[PDB]
Amino acid sequence: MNENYPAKSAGYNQGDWVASFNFSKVYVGEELGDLNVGGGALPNADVSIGNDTTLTFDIAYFVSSNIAVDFFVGVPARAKFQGEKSISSLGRVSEVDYGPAILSLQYHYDSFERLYPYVGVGVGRVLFFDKTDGALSSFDIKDKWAPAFQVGLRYDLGNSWMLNSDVRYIPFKTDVTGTLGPVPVSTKIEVDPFILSLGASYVFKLAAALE
Numbered sequence: 699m700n701e702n703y704p705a706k707s708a709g710y711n712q713g714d715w716v717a718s719f720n721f722s723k724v725y726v727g728e729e730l731g732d733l734n735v736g737g738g739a740l741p742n743a744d745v746s747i748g749n750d751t752t753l754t755f756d757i758a759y760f761v762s763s764n765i766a767v768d769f770f771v772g773v774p775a776r777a778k779f780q781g782e783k784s785i786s787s788l789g790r791v792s793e794v795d796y797g798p799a800i801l802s803l804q805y806h807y808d809s810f811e812r813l814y815p816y817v818g819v820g821v822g823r824v825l826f827f828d829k830t831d832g833a834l835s836s837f838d839i840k841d842k843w844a845p846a847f848q849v850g851l852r853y854d855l856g857n858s859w860m861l862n863s864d865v866r867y868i869p870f871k872t873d874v875t876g877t878l879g880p881v882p883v884s885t886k887i888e889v890d891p892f893i894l895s896l897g898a899s900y901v902f903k904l905a906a907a908l909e
Contacts, residue, residue, distance in 0.1 A: 716900065737880050800822030801820050808852065848864060861896075
């Protein structure tokens with residue numbers, strides 16, 4: 699004889715697994731200038747109509763109320779690398795990662811289901827950077843991860859699935875972007891490019907532990 703226990707949509711303790719999915723988007727003044735020399739903010743070389751949404755996935759593990767685990771996974775994109783003066787190094791360090799992996803912790807101060815911000819801090823690295831081709835042997839490192847932070851948003855769109863967003867500032871290399879046709883007058887230049895992602899998330903319970 700055995701007893702049954704048909705549970706329903708309820709809470710969950712440490713060990714929760716929430717599937718986060720959202721697309722990233724690059725925010726930068728391209729219309730102003732893109733790979734062109736000139737000191738004029740005139741209309742030209744307008745961006746081509748289309749979509750630049752980068753489907754990105756992330757794993758959110760709920761273990762603590764004060765702090766939660768977060769993992770980023772998705773295709774690469776224009777962004778910083780290490781952000782620090784090189785003291786000791788030598789090589790090329792290319793960016794040919796296909797399936798990278800980032801690990802960071804998330805912190806919130808809502809303690810409830812409502813439209814509140816979200817903080818995230820941790821480090822990121824590449825996964826299986828080593829390729830399968832006979833080109834250059836001994837070209838892989840044990841583990842190479844760097845520091846990084848990010849701030850997202852948490853909003854409730856429905857009941858089961860919710861809405862999640864991600865915001866991260868991106869540095870701009872020294873360079874000018876404009877169009878031909880110089881003018882006597884002067885205009886302000888406030889671009890400040892950055893990366894922002896938006897999507898939804900769903901909490902799930904793997905219900906699998908061994909201790």
